């Protein structure tokens, strides 16, 4: 019922973005926080 | 030889200055930089 073009490549972009958050997620990010430090003693 | 005035009178005051000098030397600036401190971790 819908375009040809359209479902196929709008899928496989969408698991390619789920892909990438996920192994972004579960390791470039982890420690964003823990690691940010200042150089003071505030 | 000397006048009246002077002699007692500048004698007095730097012997009132030598006094103060060593009580300030002794207490008042032993640690002006051991307990100097920044607020920083540099």
Chains 1, 2 share one sequence.
Do not use: P, Y
């Not at 040809?4 to 996920?22: D, K, P, Q, Y």
Request: aromatic share 12%; hydrophobic share 55%.
């Amino acid at each position: 019922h819908s375009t040809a073009i359209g479902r196929v490549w709008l899928s496989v972009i969408f698991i390619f973005r789920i892909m990438v958050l996920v192994v972004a997620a579960e390791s470039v990010w982890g420690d964003e926080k823990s690691s940010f430090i200042c150089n003071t003693l505030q």
